[PDB]
Design a protein around this nucleic acid. Structure first.
Ligand SMILES: C[C@@H]1C[C@@H]([C@H](O)CC2CC(=O)NC(=O)C2)C(=O)[C@@H](C)C1
Lengths: 213, 52, 289, 160
RNA sequence: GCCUCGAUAGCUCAGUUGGGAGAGCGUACGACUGAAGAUCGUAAGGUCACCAGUUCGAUCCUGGUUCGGGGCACCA
RNA sequence: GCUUACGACCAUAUCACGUUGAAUGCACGCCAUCCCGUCCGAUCUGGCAAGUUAAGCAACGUUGAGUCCAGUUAGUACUUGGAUCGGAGACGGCCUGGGAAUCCUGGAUGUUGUAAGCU
RNA sequence: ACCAUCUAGUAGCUGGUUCCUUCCGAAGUUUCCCUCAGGAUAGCUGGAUCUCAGGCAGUUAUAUUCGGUAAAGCUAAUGAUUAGAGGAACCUAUUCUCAAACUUUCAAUGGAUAUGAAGUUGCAGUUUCUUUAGUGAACUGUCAACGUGAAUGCGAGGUCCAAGUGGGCCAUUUUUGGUAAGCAGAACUGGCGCUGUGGGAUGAACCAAACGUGGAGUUAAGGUGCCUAACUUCUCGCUCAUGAGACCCCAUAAAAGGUGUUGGUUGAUAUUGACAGCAAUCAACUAGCCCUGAAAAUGGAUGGCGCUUAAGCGAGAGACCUAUACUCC
RNA sequence: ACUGAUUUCUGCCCAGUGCUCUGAAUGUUAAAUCGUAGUAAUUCGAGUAAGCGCGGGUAAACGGCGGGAGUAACUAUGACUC
RNA sequence: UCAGAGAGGACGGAAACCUCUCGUAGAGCAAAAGGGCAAAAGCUUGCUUGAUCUUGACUUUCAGUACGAGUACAGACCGCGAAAGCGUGGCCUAUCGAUCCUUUUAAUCCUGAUUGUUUCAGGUAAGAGGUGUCAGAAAAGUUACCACAGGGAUAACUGGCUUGUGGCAGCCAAGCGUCCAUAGCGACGUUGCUUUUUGAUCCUUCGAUGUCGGCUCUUCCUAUCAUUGCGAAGCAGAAUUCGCC
RNA sequence: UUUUUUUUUU
């Protein structure tokens, strides 16, 4: 069976990503990372909520997927599949190791002790720090209550302490809502699907004319 | 009974116990390891210079 | 198709040295040609640069420094009309004459011409200036640049000219004209004839016999200058004699006033004004289209 | 334990600088080195011959021999409680003139010139000693067009 | 757990340095027989266990993965 | 204001497109008997001077890319030394000194030596 | 088998190794060894002294340099990796998250060198080296002139003979293996070992401070209700716990909760009379103390007794007590 | 030497290791002997016994004595087949 | 001038060869990895033997010993090049060996001491034959019939730290529970507790702490099976479940 | 030299 999370909770070793040196790493449990109305236009979901961590620990792929499913079910049932866009902002890339030992009577005969104790891959965990964003979501201003309740329900699936906050930014973009609105009215921000691109000044006036800013 | 146990714990203290000895000042005077041709010419020059 | 010369490519690009980009200096050979042994310190190492343009032959003497080479003497084929020749300033005879002029000129300048006269009788035999008295002959190492080293090349013609003038240029007769690569034999008579331009006169006669029109098309300005296939050798001999008689450089003229012929770079305000004008014009066209 | 090869751990030490590979510029060879001069050692990976050992990289030494295309250098090396003046034959490409000694020579030249000039002109001998920067002296500051600004700490703001 | 060995037609087994994939039985066709079986004459057939690399070309040579099989797993 | 030979620093010099180019020069260019080298006079080599600035090359243009410099980021990140400092811990702040780098913003677009020459 | 002798057999192993004072005073680290319980070797240490009377330094300043770790970057190369956008894949510009064996860039600490007399200017000789060349390089001379060129501290250097050691351990920070370990392995420095003394009730390592033998005074850390020398001293708050809490290492406690109480943040309603019943109120948060979460075996531990406007928790003030420490005798 | 009254039986294997029997066997073999060269020490070569190597026997000598697939008018199993 | 890309050309196709553009090295350089390299260190080709003879100095390991490897010179004779120049093996970082003995090469060498000649033998100098446990003994097992000097530097039983494993208890609720997440359970996750499991370690004990189980006899702890007093049920009652003191 | 079989009732 899987070892308790307390064994690999805290960050102690250097990063151990899957590479040519570490082979035979089992697939991580969490595969999906963007749920809800992911293909939404930038303006569909102006309100944004973050779920930050207050601990420097390891978030297992199992825990990440558990929180994902919990929040996704809550929002699908309370607000519809096409009313939100949830983004898991943390990917499990750190590999933990286990030094398996036999646990039957007489195991000491075949046990190797501490000689050559380098472990084998066990699972994929995501290294987290204080202030790191675990979950993010963009929704309509009339669904912030559901967003906060969903993040509340999900945080109990993670170890340690998490804090749910609402961001001043326009959805997942990098501009506060007021500046985003002003720049979009001006013509400096071009739709980039979920996000937007800044249209800088410099360059040939031939492309300038296509959108005079 | 493992007995490899290498370390560098007290070695700096031992080295500084008697002070770190800097190199002498006459080491730059010897012509050891200088070019043989140059040394030969120098020997010829020194052999011939008139004292007075 | 994926774009190759993109932002990352230009970010990572490293430009070769200026002269390698210009395809004008071979640095691998230059390092070996110009670098002096560190135990000789700041003693100059002298290089005889030979170059052949489409219409001229350049021979120079130089030595290197941290801030650029120092050319000490020079001689150009276009400077031969003072010693005669008006045409054929690129052939073997002109190259040899330019080399001889350079050698005599620099020996005069450094005051060794009287001590070292070199070979004053053109015979085509290999000649190495032999040390006379106490002062050894001036020494230079040949620099051909990017020219191919073939037997009978005009670069080696210039080198032979300098060596005959009396500058110690280390060399072998292997790549002189008249040296047979197969039998490894040297034909001094053939080399002398090529130096004196007998090949040019032979071509003149051959074309004159073959076709008059082709002969004129080939030797138009030779005839205008009055050089025919029975006078060229004597002309080259006279040129050699004049070069050996006098080799001082020609005097310099006065500096004429100069006026701008090219456009001057716009200022910051001018560039911004042009930007504004183009913006206004483009907006006008967009509105009117 | 580590292997004891010559170039162990020199991956970045012996590498060229970014966008700096290729042909070696010729001022390196044109530079003049004389016995008694001080030179810094910085290995050039592009020249595998006459390389200095990794322990002498970034160290300054004094030349004692000048060969065709190399120099013998005396470099101090720490070995336990003694500093050994090791002798190494390094090629020119791995060598660079040291500027500390030339700066000191310039200062000595200036000192001698000032002393000679003052003595010839009859002036008193001037001060020729470097002094540590002394504490700032007394002065006055005017507030005209520079009125003091009252500063206070700022309140905490939740920056999401 | 450690140390080895093997994986090739439907089945059982060879095979070469690396340049052919074979042997037997099985399957299909024709013949002999009243018919079947034996017998005779033909044909087609393999995941070279999977992957990556090495060289001109790899079933073969090298490394890793999956399955199976063998030996050891002792003191007190 | 320029051209050539040889350079030094090796993009502020590179790259893209375009305009102009007086004089020297460079270059393209014509020919292939001879020297020389190729399947091929394309390259290389040799003899020349009808023609051209078309290209190279030089100067200039571009709200040009790159490169370089500066500001901002920011006294921020990080960090030396101190505490019978806070906290269960992870960590956090304070005292004492050092102190960055991206994004973004603005500017610059080769300098120069020896020799020869043009204007 | 037994008896005598070789025989006091050899032992890198165990045990012991006998008077007093004075001075100095370590190592468990390097290399080689059929080497790992042992040696030789260098290091650390003692003694004898000898040559002299300014050049050195576990410290700074100035000048010049080396590095690729922290931070930073991947909308820069390599390797991963989510999502769409504009022209199923493909291209373009983006985007989320990463690297011990990635990097354009790049600290702080850190390393090295130089900072004058063994120097600087000239003049005047030598060379068979070097140069076309007194052209250079170097040297030589009882050559001529100039005179100490950052701070602070301080006497410096040389030779010989030889011991013990060559099981280490602990701590702040960094760090590898391991689920962890009073586990195993490393880096810098300081310690214990070798070391007593005041304090932490007790302790090899913690805090203070190192020691001849005495005295007076003052303190460090720590403390002042009684054990116990020093106040039930002074000011403001918080806390009631059916065994509260009580001082670095340190002698366990978490997620989650409380309509206990005390402060704060935000948003509303309210005197055009706010909530309850036929004059402030409401809601969500936040963090101090307290409570629940909180189960182990002989009877027992803020050290004990006890303490509740404390003798507890936090911020502070006067004075006072006390070292083998500091001053003086 | 092994086995171990009586009763009833004592199967297959001589490939391995032993033991043993023949030898024509120039396959391999020491000392001695013989021949060659040399002035001699000495060098080269030839023979050269037993043994070993070739052949046969022997297990109441030491000892040893297999795998994988398919298959029967319900299934199962597998007399049978490869 | 490479890897590669784009665009063209009978058979020719995704892939044969030819052609033109672009191409910062994305190729190649005997091998592992990392550095380095573009008129080259890569590819093609010509000629060659510097992979030769000789002594010192130095770097690396380091005791500043040796071997090995390498660096910069000096003397000789050479190779390539027109020349400057480059060359003592491999672009650099690994690719290897003491004493004794044998063997070979070298001098028109030295010695065999009663005088000489020739064999023979021994020496001086440089290589090879090998020690891979690679600073270099010539080396198969078993002991339960066992012995000695020691070791808690070192294992097996207890004790000590740790708790992966073992056991026990919590938090959010996706679902089960006819409907109903919480009567009673509770997945995906996650927080703790305990030392009646087995492991990890090797701190104490090897000049000895008698090492399983049972019997007998005390006392203690509860995480409560029964009984006392209670609260809650998917509690109408023999019965049964959860919870509290 | 080799030469095995022929479903039940009629
Ligand atoms: C060169 C190598 C070694 C040599 C010989 O055996 C070495 C000697 C060494 C020593 O000192 N004493 C001895 O008894 C043997 C020999 O015949 C071969 C193995 C080859």
């Amino acid at each position: 069976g899987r070892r308790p999370a307390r064994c690999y909770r805290y960050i102690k070793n250097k990063p151990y990503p899957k590479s040519r040196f570490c082979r035979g790493v089992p697939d991580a449990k969490i595969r999906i990372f963007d749920l809800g109305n992911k293909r939404a236009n930038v303006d569909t979901f102006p309100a944004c909520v973050h779920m930050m961590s207050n601990e420097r620990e390891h978030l297992s792929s199992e825990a990440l997927e558990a929180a994902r499913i919990c929040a996704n079910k809550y929002m699908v049932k309370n607000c519809g599949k096409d009313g939100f866009h949830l983004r898991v902002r943390k990917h499990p890339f750190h590999v933990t190791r286990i030094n398996k030992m036999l646990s039957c009577a007489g195991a000491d005969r075949l046990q190797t002790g501490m000689r050559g104790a380098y472990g084998k891959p066990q699972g994929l965990v995501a290294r987290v720090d204080i202030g790191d964003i675990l979950f993010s979501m963009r929704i309509k201003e009339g669904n912030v209550k559901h967003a906060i309740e969903a993040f509340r329900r999900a945080k109990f699936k993670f170890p340690g302490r998490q804090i749910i906050v609402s961001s001043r930014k326009w959805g997942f973009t990098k501009w506060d809502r007021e500046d985003y609105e002003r720049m979009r009215a001006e013509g400096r921000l071009r739709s980039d699907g979920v996000g937007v691109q800044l249209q800088r000044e410099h360059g040939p006036l031939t492309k300038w004319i296509e959108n005079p800013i | 009974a493992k007995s490899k146990n290498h370390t560098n714990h007290n070695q700096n203290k031992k080295a500084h116990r008697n002070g770190i000895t800097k190199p002498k000042k006459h080491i730059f005077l010897s012509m050891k390891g200088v070019d043989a041709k140059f040394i030969k010419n120098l020997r010829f020059s020194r052999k011939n210079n008139k004292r007075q | 198709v994926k774009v190759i010369k993109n932002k990352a490519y230009f970010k990572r690009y490293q430009v070769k040295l200026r002269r390698r980009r210009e395809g004008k200096t071979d640095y691998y050979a230059r390092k070996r040609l110009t670098v002096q042994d560190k135990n000789k310190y700041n003693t100059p190492k002298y290089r005889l640069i030979v170059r052949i343009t489409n219409k001229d032959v350049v021979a120079q003497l130089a030595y290197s420094k941290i801030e650029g080479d120092v050319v000490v003497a020079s001689a150009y084929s276009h400077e031969l009309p003072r010693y005669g020749l008006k045409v054929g300033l690129t052939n073997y005879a002109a190259a040899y004459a330019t080399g001889l002029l350079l050698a005599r000129r620099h020996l005069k300048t450094i005051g060794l011409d009287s001590t070292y006269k070199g070979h004053e009788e053109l015979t085509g035999e290999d000649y190495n200036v032999e040390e006379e008295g106490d002062r050894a002959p001036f020494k230079a190492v040949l620099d051909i640049g990017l020219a191919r080293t073939t037997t009978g090349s005009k670069i080696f013609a210039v080198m032979k000219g300098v060596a005959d003038g009396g500058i110690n240029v280390p060399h072998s007769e292997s790549r002189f004209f008249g040296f047979d690569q197969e039998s490894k034999e040297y034909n001094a008579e053939a080399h002398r004839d090529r130096i004196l331009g007998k090949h040019v006169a032979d071509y003149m006669t051959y074309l004159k016999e073959e076709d008059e029109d082709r002969y004129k098309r080939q030797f138009s300005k030779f005839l205008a200058a009055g050089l025919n296939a029975d006078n060229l050798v004597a002309t080259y001999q006279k040129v050699h004699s004049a070069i050996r008689a006098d080799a001082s450089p020609a005097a310099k003229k006065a500096a004429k006033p100069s006026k701008r012929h090219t456009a001057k770079r716009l200022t910051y305000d001018e560039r911004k004004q042009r930007v504004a004008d183009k913006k206004a014009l483009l907006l006008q066209l967009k509105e009117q289209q | 334990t580590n292997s004891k090869g010559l170039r162990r751990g020199t991956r970045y030490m012996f590498a060229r600088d970014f966008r700096k590979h290729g042909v070696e510029h010729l001022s390196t060879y044109y530079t003049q080195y004389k016995r008694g001069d001080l030179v810094d050692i910085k290995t050039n990976g592009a020249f595998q011959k006459g390389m200095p050992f990794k322990a002498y990289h970034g160290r300054t030494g004094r030349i004692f021999n000048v060969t065709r295309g190399a120099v013998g250098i005396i470099v101090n090396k720490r070995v336990r409680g003694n500093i050994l003046p090791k002798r190494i034959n390094i090629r020119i490409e791995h060598i660079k003139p040291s500027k500390c000694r030339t700066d000191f020579l310039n200062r000595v030249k200036s000192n001698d010139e000032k002393r000679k000039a003052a003595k010839s002109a009859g002036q008193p001998v001037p001060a020729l000693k470097r002094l540590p920067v002394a504490p700032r002296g007394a002065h006055t500051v005017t507030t005209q067009n520079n009125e003091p600004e009252l500063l206070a700490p700022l309140r905490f703001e939740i920056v999401a």
